[PDB]
Amino acid sequence: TGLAEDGAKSVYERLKNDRAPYETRAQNCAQYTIPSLFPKDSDNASTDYQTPWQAVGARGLNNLASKLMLALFPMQTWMRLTISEYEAKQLLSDPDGLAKVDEGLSMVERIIMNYIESNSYRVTLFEALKQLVVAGNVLLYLPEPEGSNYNPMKLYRLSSYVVQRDAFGNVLQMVTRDQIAFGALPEDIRKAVEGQGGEKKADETIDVYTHIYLDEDSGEYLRYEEVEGMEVQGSDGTYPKEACPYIPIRMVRLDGESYGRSYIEEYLGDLRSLENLQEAIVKMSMISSKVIGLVNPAGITQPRRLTKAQTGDFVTGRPEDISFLQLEKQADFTVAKAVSDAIEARLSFAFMLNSAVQRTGERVTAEEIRYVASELEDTLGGVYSILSQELQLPLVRVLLKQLQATQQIPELPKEAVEPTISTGLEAIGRGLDKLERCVTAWAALAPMRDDPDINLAMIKLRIANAIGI
Amino acid sequence: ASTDYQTPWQAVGARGLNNLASKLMLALFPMQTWMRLTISEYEAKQLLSDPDGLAKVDEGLSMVERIIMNYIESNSYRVTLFEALKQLVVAGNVLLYLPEPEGSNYNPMKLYRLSSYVVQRDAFGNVLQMVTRDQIAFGALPEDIRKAVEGQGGEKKADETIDVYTHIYLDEDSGEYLRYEEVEGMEVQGSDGTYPKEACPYIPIRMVRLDGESYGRSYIEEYLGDLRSLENLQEAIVKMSMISSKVIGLVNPAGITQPRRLTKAQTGDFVTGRPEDISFLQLEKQADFTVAKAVSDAIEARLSFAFMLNSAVQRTGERVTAEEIRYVASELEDTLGGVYSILSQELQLPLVRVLLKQLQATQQIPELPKEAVEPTISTGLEAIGRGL
Amino acid sequence: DKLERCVTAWAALAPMRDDPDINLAMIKLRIANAIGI
Amino acid sequence: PKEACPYIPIRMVRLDGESYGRSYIEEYLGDLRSLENLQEAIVKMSMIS
């Protein structure tokens, strides 16, 4: 039936081999930065996950994830909706349309955020964010609200799914490979496994494959989940192109690449060098630690007598004879240390660790949000923009498709019932700045109100025009 | 996907390029405002104390000001133009196309990199003809062009690469352009239309123009030679140090060491030997190391001064918005190059130019009078802020 | 926090209440809208 | 009820396909062990003196 083709498993393995290289570079990145975050396919519990010899990678990766999370999903607000595309008709002094908007959208603003708290999307998206900054891609799915019970977004790591794109980048088809134990499987898919046969112990691994793909007739997607080769009725449905329930997100896009590349990947080469050099200093020092008593046979020491002495006992011997193997590498040690420190500085400047200006006087909330913003863009990369387009705006996009539907639509009019989401700095805060500027300008207008030889009406009009009103 | 993309041995290039893109973006598309329109060419007639024409202007243009910016937010032109800006500062050219508004659904500007299109100019620089080479997968292709591929034949899997070529070119009779998109050798009815010369829907932008050059040159290109040197020198220090790291036990045979006994000892065991015999191959390059480090640091300072990284005065007390915008402006011009002006003429003013052709049409034209219904856009510092 | 921000904004509104050539109702509405209410 | 389980098993750092947790210090165990070794040598070296 079209590009459903062989079935969910086979298309999964096909695209899987093509995805393999991104997976491998995600793996190496992991070993260099932080081992336990992205594991080896074969390994289960037994794996060692040796900490890398250097810790700059781990500390910086973690700090970068934090800063990105704080600047991207701040506590106070994270989005704005403004009335659009009918502006020329009513934005011109109808205070009601704007007031209903202030009300309807404020309802929307608060609710969406409130729903967010409950479902703990903060923690879930933070972990997905760290996963994406260490590796190529992350896929997050928002399931139906299900009333009071929370439905947390689930991050599926790059190793467990697949996405295909064209040279442009459109979402052609994606296949997830989640494994859910027999018992945990929903009663419905459980019924599906049961009909094929297989009454099972709670333990059996049942694999669910979601195969969202493109329709050759309609510009829609056609989801369906299956166990093995047999399709099961997982609510086959036509989700709109603009909002896709699953959200594949790439760290740094490229032309003609159906996947993402981690940001740390760009700095992997310097990082690896640090590891090597550091390894040598740690190792070099340990060799020095061994104390290997060196004696000159020609001499009269005869170490037996020396070992025998209890403290403060005068055995025969000579000072010159007993000596200790030291390590003479001193120039080497200095060169290594200096080069390593410079490399550490570089890695650090990029990782927004050791930037050295904003740290003084840290105080969360407030408006720390504005400053930490640009600096992230300045040196991490403009990556804030890339993620912002991909995560912040879409995450809201799907929430709006669902939340508005399950609750009540306010009295807000019909031109904004399909509102246009805006995120980022334009959306950070709400504007009060223009107002405080203008009333400070008016406060500087203390001297005279019966000010002769001047026009009161117009000067106050000009002060008003200085800031948008 | 397979490509290694090795990080260059030096990171000054990456850090500075990124910071330069940021500063250029912040100064060029600030949050508070990015353009001004002032009534012009009828001024002698009414600018002389008619408070209404000015008031309608304050109103009509303020509507315009806010709307254009608002539409901009939605379509995420901030992120898209930021990436196009970085692409242009690293390379020769960038081409951005604003498609029809399509109502509520956003239509983001798409940057096409220098490798995927072509623009021809004369010695003067006029836009003669341009051809894009975008590849869109069969299924993703719009139903219309999809119909076009279907009629030639070729019912296809969603996968097939279908190539779309937009060939905007100059007319030998009219001073207009005649767009048409095609798949392979067969023209398809991609809305053949006559877009006005003043506003071209696609916008080819050059970083640093030159006489008789139909393309652009990246700004970093001017500093490529110093940059390459840094790479070479730095490579040597990184490599030199690693050679030092290897510990290669050197023993004097004439001596009585016989390393077997030394390796054997558990900690704190007195094996026979002499201190002099065991020694370690060090690296004696010290003068060399100092010369390299100093020259590299000076080169780093140069690259930095140009890249507006390590300028050292404005960093203290950073606070976004406010009027940081005025100062960061001149300094960009001062040392990056006057490039702010060049981009400003090319991107900021035209980006608005096409938005005005479209936005004013899809919405409502305010009560603003007919002498400003075709307003004259102004950008840059003259346009930064409003005047207070 | 929002409340203290808003009353500080209102305290900065000391100069004139019979402030001519301006709209009292709406400016106070905008200051109110600056912080969620 | 499934939503509230009277007992609460808690994992420090979860992983895919792992029915247990890994301590956070575990991630830094390797550097830590090295410190132990080097420090041991200084304490011991001094006592010999």
UniProtKB/Swiss-Prot annotation, chain A:
The keyword Chloroplast does not apply. The keyword Metal-binding does not apply. This is Portal protein. Keywords: Capsid protein, Viral capsid assembly, Viral genome ejection through host cell envelope, Viral genome packaging, Viral penetration into host cytoplasm, Viral release from host cell, Viral short tail ejection system, Virion, Virus entry into host cell. GO terms for cellular component: viral portal complex. Homododecamer. Interacts with major capsid protein. Interacts with the tail tube protein gp11. Interacts with the terminase large subunit. Interacts with the internal virion protein gp14. It comes from the Viruses. Forms the portal vertex of the capsid. This portal plays critical roles in head assembly, genome packaging, neck/tail attachment, and genome ejection. The portal protein multimerizes as a single ring-shaped homododecamer arranged around a central channel. GO terms for biological process: symbiont genome ejection through host cell envelope, short tail mechanism; viral DNA genome packaging. Its main location: virion. Pfam families: Head-tail_con. The lineage of its organism: Viruses, Duplodnaviria, Heunggongvirae, Uroviricota, Caudoviricetes. It is found in: Virion. Belongs to the podoviridae portal protein family.
